[PDB]
Design a protein around this ligand. Structure first.
Ligand SMILES: [Zn+2]
Ligand SMILES: [Zn+2]
Lengths: 297, 297
């Protein structure tokens, strides 16, 4: 049996980028259009919040201390206590209107993230403006590929030989060969195409059996896929439609934390999804996840 | 009911710009990379073709006689009985790889056509290189706006107050307010957004109810769109994937003609679509089209 609970009714405009900090039993996440980074202590229940000067799309662990975030079209290191960010690298300078979206650290401590055109407009507009990036330990940047609509969930297989990636308007989870030692990706192929009711695929993580959990935007669900068989294994429905992301955390990585968005709802949807934008905890999935990697620069 | 016929197994590299010439009961079209203007006699069933010296991307009737056509980055007059073009105007002189794409005459005798960067491999690059133009009856070019990808299908509403325009890599059918007397457009807005499955929006033609028909390049289909409600009204699927463009012809515009492309297909997909690059005729739609305008310069 499954328990779904709102642990923190944060009403985020757009909650994203859940990451489990095991050393302090905290969850981090972002609220993208609110430009916030948040850190929620699972023991005290207290949340702290830093507000940045541009959309903050993702946040990850930095092994030397503090955190890394993608703010606007920059990779930045964050000194949480000083409420100070230092710019590590910039991308997409040629684009007048981009941001980072989803990002996540390698098995080798490289901070992967891509971009997208900024939009809340959708159905008056356009595309293919994104590209996938990685920030190496030496603070150098690689562009993997362009023509990306919305850079979204991403992860890596337990044996470090395959990269999983979602570009959301593709409606497909893709897989690449990944070289751990160099961070090269090849042989892009589709491993799962969403069903319609699955709506927009968004955030993703891998679990300790190597299956994939995809948050489904407008979907009110997260879906478990086998990437080696090509099939859906399970659907867990949430009391909110605008599920964005998910990760594993809590004791032994046995709980799932899920982000969602309160933005773009109307009065009558807010009325009966009153916890929209909250953080949900799902217990009793009967699977554990794995620990995130920490940026190496 | 819908009835589909491959009226001509032309195998066009890329067949485009269908135009019904009702005084000879013929369909004019182009084959862009073969650099051919084409004319199929719907009665004898035979196709005549003239070879130009640069890719021909559109053709239109000329009020005073013969044809106009866009050949490379040039608006040309075409006398079909000799077979050479007389340049009337050049655009994009500073872009030494641009070509015109799609073009159609105004309810007022102005030849609209926009350009794109010619592509590779072959072809395919890079990007925002295009602009939208309109040759006036005095042989002077107006320009309109740039950073287009693939200037594609275009038509006018039946009140002559709305210009509809497709830029392919925009996956959006757009509308502008349009002013007959001056050819001025303004208030560009998305009236429709393509679903993953519909692929890339290519040519298009309004019907006598004011709906819009758009050929979905790699969607093997034309979809009929309500500009005012922004919803898809029906899908007509086709024997072949690279449907490029569409127009109304046959007696009083009661039949629809779909062009297609066979360039960019592998040896075994050609063998599943024996009719890639042909001309299809669809009867049974319930609506008629409207006649083409003739160029008044
Ligand atoms: Zn996301
Ligand atoms: Zn076209």
């Amino acid at each position: 049996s499954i328990k779904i609970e709102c642990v923190l009714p944060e009403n985020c405009r757009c909650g994203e980028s859940p990451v489990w900090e095991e050393v302090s039993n905290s969850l981090l996440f972002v609220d993208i259009p609110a430009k916030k980074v948040c850190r929620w202590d699972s023991f005290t229940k207290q949340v702290q919040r830093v507000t940045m000067d541009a959309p903050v799309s993702s946040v990850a662990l930095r092994q030397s201390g503090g955190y890394v975030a993608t703010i606007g079209t920059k990779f930045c290191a964050l000194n949480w206590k000083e409420q100070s960010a230092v710019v590590l690298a910039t991308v997409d300078n040629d684009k007048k209107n981009n941001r980072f979206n989803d990002g996540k650290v390698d098995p080798a401590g490289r901070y992967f993230a891509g971009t997208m055109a900024e939009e809340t407009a959708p159905a008056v507009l356009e595309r293919h403006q994104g590209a996938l990036y990685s920030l190496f330990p030496d603070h150098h940047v690689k562009k993997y590929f362009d023509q990306v609509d919305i850079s979204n969930g991403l992860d890596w297989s337990l044996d470090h030989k395959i990269f999983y990636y979602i570009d959301s308007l593709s409606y497909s989870v893709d897989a690449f060969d990944y070289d751990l030692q160099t961070g090269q990706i090849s042989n892009r192929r589709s491993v799962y195409k969403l069903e319609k009711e699955e709506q927009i695929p968004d955030g993703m993580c891998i679990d300790a059996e190597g299956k994939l959990w995809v948050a489904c935007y407008n979907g009110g669900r997260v879906i478990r896929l086998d990437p080696v068989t090509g099939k859906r294994l399970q659907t867990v429905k949430l009391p909110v439609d605008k599920t964005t992301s998910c990760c594993f955390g809590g004791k032994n990585y046995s709980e799932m934390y899920v982000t969602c968005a309160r933005d773009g709802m109307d009065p009558e949807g807010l009325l009966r999804q009153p916890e929209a934008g909250g953080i949900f905890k799902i217990t009793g999935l009967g699977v554990k996840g794995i620990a995130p990697y920490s940026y190496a620069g």
